């Protein structure tokens with residue numbers, strides 16, 4: 001799949017073939033300095049946002065933490081919070097998601113940050129969305 005270059009936020013975009021085991025999705029961009037305190041990358045089924053298999057949600061709030069969660073039929077599940085903030089307001093980042101059989105692995109700036117065990121079947125994910133306090137340079141697929 002060809003990369004999305006400079007896509008405007010809020011973005012959604014199709015993932016050709018959907019998520020498969022071993023797929024790596026790179027989101028390269030910049031956290032805005034003064035344009036809010038949260039952003040999210042969502043791996044979801046379709047364009048509606050009611051079914052998000054993996055919501056990855058850094059929050060520059062309450063000391064800095066990242067929320068990982070799943071939305072199913074419009075309902076959010078129990079949050080998994082990583083109380084580390086690997087991003088910095090105003091700074092560029094490279095975020096890479098590795099789809100594995102049991103979990104997503106998430107690397108930030110070349111370092112494994114968190115894993116998230118699948119709560120719903122990943123093959124059903126065919127869409128990536130990004131919203132919030134970020135500007136995107138590219139989203140690429142291998």
Ligand SMILES: CC(=O)N[C@@H]1[C@@H](O)[C@H](O[C@@H]2O[C@H](CO)[C@H](O)[C@H](O[C@@H]3O[C@H](CO)[C@@H](O[C@@H]4O[C@H](CO)[C@H](O)[C@H](O)[C@H]4O)[C@H](O)[C@H]3NC(C)=O)[C@H]2O)[C@@H](CO)O[C@H]1O
Nearest residue numbers: 010038040042047048049050055057067069076079131132
């Ligand atoms: C202590 C505790 O449990 N705290 C709870 C809060 O964490 C919780 O806040 C919600 O948490 C979930 C994750 O669990 C999400 O981050 C909710 O944020 C919403 O996220 C969605 C998906 O990114 C986003 O919807 C998208 O918006 C874009 C436009 O930007 C477009 O419309 C898309 O189609 C759509 O999917 C939505 O805007 C966003 N809202 C906010 C306010 O950030 C987050 O609210 C709350 C409420 O569930 O419960 C506390 O108890």
